[PDB]
């Protein structure tokens, strides 16, 4: 494939501590490329990856313009939601939005998304037909009817099918040496005695991209999933990812245990033992 572009808006009210904060991040697959924070010294859409910095003033001014209008829209939306749910102006509330497009290997739109949450529950969502909405409650039904009336789905369909797909094509080309070039994990097994009778085996995958990875332990075959301590994949802080999988083994059994790594960047699946 792959491939995807996503924007994540967070609009948070903070009564008595100024106006709501608005934060927007843009991703292409597992890589952040743009950010916007209404609490910055001078609000602007800023680059987050090396391949986007090559954009011109018009791109940045244009995006900053769009984010400032969105910030205000979602400031209004917070006031609106407060009357839909009949809540006080004393409490902090949150709107989240995520939208974007997925394209196949040929660059054709596979799937578009546009979802909203209020206080962390699904609020309203664009259906895959890109023409109707699913509303989670009767308050979202009010919003739904407004968007049917305003033909919001038709405007958003055109964005997902046009601009969103066109720009992802540009981004994928401009960042092809990282976004389309896969980073295999560096791997190694460590051995730490717990007691005289037990030892931990930990399998490491470091500096890999994309984030997707499978890391399993086996004992002569087959899987030891229900006994493996697996940490959630984590960012290294340099655009790449980290993961480990641990298993507590009886002393004398360490040679029966194999680690197995699956990742797009590896041409062949890895088998590792402690040495």
């Amino acid at each position: 494939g792959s491939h995807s572009m996503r924007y994540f808006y967070t609009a948070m009210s903070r009564p008595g501590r100024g106006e709501p904060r608005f934060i927007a991040v843009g991703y292409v697959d597992d890589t952040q490329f743009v950010r916007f924070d209404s609490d910055a010294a001078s609000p602007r859409m800023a680059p987050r990856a090396p391949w986007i910095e090559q954009e011109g003033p018009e791109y940045w001014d244009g995006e900053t313009r769009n984010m400032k209008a969105s910030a205000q829209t979602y400031r209004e939306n917070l006031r609106i939601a407060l009357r839909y749910y009949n809540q006080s102006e004393a409490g902090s509330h949150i709107i989240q939005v995520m939208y974007g497009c997925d394209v196949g290997p040929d660059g054709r739109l596979l799937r578009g998304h546009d979802q909203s949450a209020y206080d962390g529950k699904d609020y309203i969502a664009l259906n895959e037909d890109l023409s109707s909405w699913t509303a989670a409650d009767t308050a979202a039904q009010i919003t739904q009817r407004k968007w049917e009336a305003a033909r919001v789905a038709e405007q958003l369909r055109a964005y997902l099918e046009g601009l969103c797909v066109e720009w992802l094509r540009r981004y994928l080309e401009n960042g092809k040496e990282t976004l389309q070039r896969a980073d295999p994990p560096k791997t190694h097994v460590t051995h730490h005695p717990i007691s005289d009778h037990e030892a931990t085996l930990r399998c490491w995958a470091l500096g890999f991209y994309p984030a997707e990875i499978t890391l399993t332990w086996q004992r002569d075959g087959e899987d030891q999933t229900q006994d493996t301590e697996l940490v959630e994949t984590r960012p290294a802080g340099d655009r790449t990812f980290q993961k480990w999988a641990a298993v507590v083994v009886p002393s004398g059994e360490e040679q029966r245990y194999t680690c197995h790594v699956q990742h797009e960047g590896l041409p062949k699946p890895l088998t590792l033992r402690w040495e």
């Binding site: 769009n66 984010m67 839909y84 939005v97 939208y99 909203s116 009010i142 964005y159 601009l163 969103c164």
Partner: peptide, 9 residues
């Protein structure tokens, strides 16, 4: 590029 589509509730 973000969406220019106003989503008012």
């Amino acid at each position: 590029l973000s969406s220019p589509v106003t989503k008012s509730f």
